[PDB]
Design a protein around this ligand. Structure first.
Ligand code: N72
Ligand code: MG
Ligand code: MG
Length: 493
């Protein structure tokens, strides 16, 4: 049939298409269409078990698994005429990914010692110690994507809006705040895409997005976490709703160094007046689930019994009075305008009033909000995300003190947590599998009991499409929790 795909997303604009910085779901989704990596998750899977060849046609490790040699596919071409992808591009990209001055994801690569071009088609990666999940680090997510040395060196600060990858689609143009026009990479190494163009539309307003989808302007539209939207879409036999793994866990990360939240009783009071099970029941159990820990349930090392504080708003009021707040606590939070996070913050705002908290929400456009929270501008941060499914990733990034906002090594530790550093570090390199699991669980119990963060629900990604669109594979998951459009995506007659 037709070869042009139109999709409506919950975003206001592009922030960065440099894969070493792209963090919002929208920027990560675009990056997943433009770039590739040495290896990749199988299309339609978010599980590292599925990892398969991408730019690297084969690889091997030495006996001690400290030296890995990747053999590159010969004639993989960059978009825009930058020529053949070489080992020098891989060295440049991985060294950039592992540099805290040029990447938002450098901490994931701390165990890489060196990356060397043995020849134009051979890359040698030497590790400081064994890294069981190395292939996930080298895959098509976060810092694994490969970029062109020549394009980045020249474009510099403009590369983020004029990206160049070897993926199936290229950015032809950006219409700021309206859309991104992507076109098929005619030289894509797996074959020319069946789609000729993608019109990626910024439709943050849910009512306008739904109207564009029902009027036939969109072939795909991002949904939300509400079962009511899910039921209204599934009612039309022409629509298909995809619920996409991994589930992103939402937490209230509390800055434990800032009064009044430096008193554990105040944090405990907040935790006793949130009700994640009620949010999950309201939003719907197919897409949403309350999580009994501070990392997503789909993690090796997840603790189903971390000790999450129960709902008891009478106890919240008692604790606030003991802490010197007989008339309650008021707090202003900088809150994202991404509709799912905005509606979640509004649900929490209503819940916490029962226990004596009056939450004032200062709304900020999503990408601007991401910048503000990373400047330590909010006392509490409602953040929702998933990472590779090994506890070390979520724990290190959100809760290890090295990740604390304000440090050169900062990641997403908005709570300024430091209570679990020794357990996180010991678990990371523990070779006894059961002991490693127990150290990850001990870290979760400490973070929960000190109330550095309060878990809410985790939600699968929700997207609607017309049944005339075929992905070319089963869309079970995608690391950004969004559809993956590839050279296989097609329309039916
Ligand atoms: O990877 C990251 O660090 C950020 C993840 C990215 N995910 C969107 C997100 O927070 C979730 O969809 C979120 O769980 C809300 O919509 C909850 O209703 C973000 O754009 O903020
Ligand atoms: Mg955005
Ligand atoms: Mg902590």
């Amino acid at each position: 049939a037709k070869t042009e795909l139109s999709m409506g997303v919950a975003s206001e604009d592009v922030t960065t298409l440099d894969p070493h910085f792209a963090t919002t779901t929208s920027d990560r989704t675009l990056v997943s269409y433009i770039y590739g990596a040495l290896v990749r998750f199988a299309p339609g899977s978010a599980n590292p078990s599925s990892i398969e060849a991408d730019l690297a046609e084969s690889w091997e490790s030495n006996a001690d698994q400290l030296v890995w040699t990747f053999k590159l596919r010969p004639d993989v071409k960059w978009q825009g005429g930058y020529g053949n992808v070489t080992a020098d591009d891989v060295v440049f990209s991985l060294d950039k990914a592992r540099d805290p001055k040029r990447s938002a994801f450098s901490g994931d690569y701390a165990a890489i010692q060196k990356v060397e071009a043995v020849d134009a088609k051979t890359v040698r990666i030497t590790l400081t110690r064994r890294v069981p999940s190395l292939l996930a680090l080298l895959s098509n997510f976060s810092g694994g994507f490969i970029i062109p040395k020549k394009a980045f060196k020249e474009r510099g600060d403009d590369f983020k809006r004029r990206p160049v990858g070897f993926g199936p689609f290229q950015v032809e143009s950006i219409q700021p705040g309206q859309s991104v026009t992507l076109t098929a990479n005619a030289e894509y190494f797996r074959g020319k895409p069946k789609l000729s163009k993608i019109s990626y539309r910024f439709l943050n307003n849910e009512a306008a997005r739904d109207l564009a989808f029902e009027s036939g302007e969109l072939d795909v539209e991002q949904g939300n976490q509400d079962q009511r939207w899910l039921q209204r879409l599934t009612a039309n036999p022409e629509n298909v709703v995809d619920t996409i793994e991994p589930a992103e866990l939402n937490l209230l990360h509390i800055n434990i160094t800032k009064p009044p939240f430096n008193d554990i009783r105040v944090r405990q009071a907040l935790a006793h007046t949130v009700n994640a099970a009620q949010i999950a029941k309201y939003r719907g159990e197919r897409v949403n689930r309350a999580v009994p820990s501070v990392i997503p349930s789909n993690n090796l090392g997840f603790d189903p019994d971390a000790g999450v504080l129960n709902y008891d708003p009478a106890q919240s009021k008692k604790l606030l009075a003991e802490a010197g707040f007989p008339n309650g606590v008021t707090v202003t939070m900088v809150a994202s305008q991404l509709p799912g996070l905005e509606s979640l913050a509004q649900l929490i705002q209503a819940q916490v009033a029962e226990g004596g908290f009056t939450l004032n929400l200062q709304p900020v456009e999503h990408a601007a909000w991401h910048q503000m929270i990373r400047k330590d501008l909010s006392p509490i941060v409602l953040y929702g995300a998933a990472r590779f499914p090994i506890a070390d990733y979520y724990l290190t990034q959100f809760y290890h003190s090295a990740s604390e906002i304000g440090k050169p090594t900062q990641v997403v530790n908005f709570s300024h947590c430091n209570v679990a550093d020794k357990q996180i570090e010991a678990a990371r390199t523990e070779t006894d599998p059961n002991k490693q699991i127990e150290l990850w669980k001990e870290a979760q119990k400490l973070i929960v009991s000190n109330v550095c963060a309060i878990p809410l629900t985790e939600n699968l990604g929700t997207w609607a499409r017309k049944n005339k669109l075929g992905w070319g594979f089963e869309l079970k998951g995608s690391m950004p929790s969004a559809p993956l459009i590839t050279e296989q995506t097609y329309f039916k007659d």
